[PDB]
Subunit: 171 residues, 6 copies
């Protein structure tokens, strides 16, 4: 059984409350897909004489696709206004034998809706893409052993605003 | 039963009266599809020292596709002349069990036809794309409960001319 | 029964006499398809202080596709020479129950062949695309009632050379 | 029966003798397809005060596709050297009931091979595209009546080097 | 039987320990595909008067595609931070009758993760592309005789940082 | 029976010895496809007053696709180093009834590997494209009569370094 599901929750002063009725994500947004891109310009053939490298990594926006729903106008206005959210969390699920597993969890700190792109076609459920831009990110991947049983998590992080491996927006 | 339908009405001094015979949209335009794009350039890693952020959101034109019909020359001339309409309303429908639901309603204030792109091919019903540019927008999404019964509406808005969350073109 | 047909007639000093044997369009060109584009740059968020707006609409060429035939060299030479035609008329037909209807009629005033693009492939009837550029246009769409019976025509027009809604090239 | 065939003959000091064994085109090149493009920049909304218009038409190269054969190295060298040919003739054939008809004939005056693009793939007969650039062109289209019987030819021409409707390279 | 498999191991201060349970690559990353590009600008029609040629080869990043797994956040952070690895080794396998053969082995010296591009779609196993940039490379191709039996290896190398055929990053 | 085959031999100080076991090409590289492009900028509507034309032909690299094999690292290093080869020969074969014919032979003088682009995918035999840049070329096409029996060869040539029809790199 496929048990794929992705859920998003906004946490800030402005509310983007979703429609999900999943017991573990009541009021979260249900989304269909996710894509990202990270690009590091640092040279492998030149090095700084000292401890300062000018360039830094570029993180692209995280882009999600979702069905149009009651959260859509909320996203459209939030994008237009440039409202900042303290945190956004995204949980990713897949099948794990008899129950699902949250294999990936992403937390974004100091977040804006950078784009929304809605369409209604003649055929098919209407959908929109939306992008998120952020100051810091914490990624957690949940491992399992050969029996599919949960082993330890791998947690990594990056602060674009501090240029350090921290889940922190401020200095 | 699929009950998809999109209807557009122009409201201004210049008439773009449509062909629809739908009881609830007599004389509106029937259209086939819609697409939009909203892009916010605001940074998540830098902030203004004060309360002024230079950049603002960019709303792309709202683009509709429709069959060529008697409104087509009206659109072609309105686009050519750059006539402004006080308001344009778009109603979006889908199935809701035994009757249809208007799941999305968009009102645009101070509107121009920014483009029209008609084609007649050897095969298929002739169609055209047309785009609308506007000073302000009000979006209403009509929610339903788990039984499909109407719950409360979500209404949001944005004024490009005022740079505020208002359905107003003028200051 | 599909009764799709498009006919073009050039009216000027230089003759581009066609091959059609249709009783109502003897010697017109038979063409297969048509495409156009109209783009209005006027802003919806800024307005002139006075009555003058700098920019004007851009009409793209009207582009037609036709089978290669005896008119082809006539088009190739007319395009090369830049001959101007006083008028070009295009009639568009579709089925209307037992007889066809001219649903769209376009008249172009002060017209040049702006491009011709012929091909002969290994397979298929050879065809060419050709484009027309013009000073003014009159568009007529022929309406029908719910019984398919002719109702009134919708006629609109635009003069690119006068920047007014007129079917006139000269001032 | 399809009787499609295109034949090309070079006429100049440098020989590009072909492989055809067709009785009417012995030693011509057999080619598979042809494409061209003619673009006229003249405005329909502005006119010269006098009798001089600056811009002129742009004729693209005539591009042919053919199987690789013994003429291929001849084309490759002629293109490399920039050899000029006094004339190149191209005859185009299609079915006409019981016999074929030369529906199109093109003569090019003062001609260069402007490009050659050969490929050998794992599958399929190797082919190359080649382009011809020229000073003047004469196009002849052979008409037929409703019975398919030959009627009169349509002959048109253009000199790029003289900017007149003449089949002449020199002044 | 297809026995295709590609394995990657990072060797540096920062750990990117993988998930593989293959007996010969325990804890390596399993990857699905690889692509590269090498471009030499040196002219064949001009030569230096002396022994110095200005330009040098450009090696593109080596790009791998892999399933998302517990190493993914490790790659995302390593790319973000620009961590350098002393060495990365990649082993490539295919079938060789009754057992597999390592037909290609690549060692990269002084290596950075230059890009990572993860996606989760509605359908299909989530994957990411990642790119590696490096100072030097050693390529080993393992040959076999007509009986499929191992013959001698072909080993070649290049140092981008020294511009010589050496597997060395430093001078 | 298809008897398509392409073989390449490098002849220079640096060895790029191939894997072929074909009796007539022992140790040559077997390749799968070939593509080229030759472009002549000379005008057909303007001519030099004297005997000097500034521009010259541009030959693109000759691009080959081959399976990855033991020659691959040799190509990768040769490209990286910019090694020059005195000559490279390419023989092209197709079926000729009961035996194959070498229909095309290309010799390149003073040659560099200008690019190599290898890929290993999940499915399919790994392949690479490689390009060759050169100072001169001799092309030989082997003709046959209507009975498929060998007739005379057509040999043509071009020197990019001398700008003459010669198979010579040096002056």
């Amino acid at each position: 059984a496929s048990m794929k599901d992705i859920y998003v929750e906004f946490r800030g002063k402005y509310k983007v409350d979703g429609e999900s009725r999943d017991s573990e994500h009541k009021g979260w947004l249900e989304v269909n897909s996710w894509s990202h891109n990270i690009r590091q310009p640092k040279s492998a053939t030149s090095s700084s004489v000292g401890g300062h490298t000018a360039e830094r990594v570029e993180h692209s926006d995280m882009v999600f696709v979702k069905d149009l729903d009651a959260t859509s106008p909320k996203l459209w206005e939030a994008c237009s206004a440039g409202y900042t959210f303290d945190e956004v969390q995204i949980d990713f699920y897949r099948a794990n034998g008899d129950k699902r597993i949250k294999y990936l969890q992403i937390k974004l700190k100091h977040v804006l809706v950078s784009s929304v792109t809605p369409t209604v076609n003649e055929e098919g459920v209407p959908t929109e893409a939306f992008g998120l831009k952020y100051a810091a990110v914490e990624w957690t991947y949940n491992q399992q052993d050969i029996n599919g049983t949960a082993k330890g998590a791998v947690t990594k992080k990056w602060s674009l605003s501090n240029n350090t491996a921290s889940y922190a927006a401020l200095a």
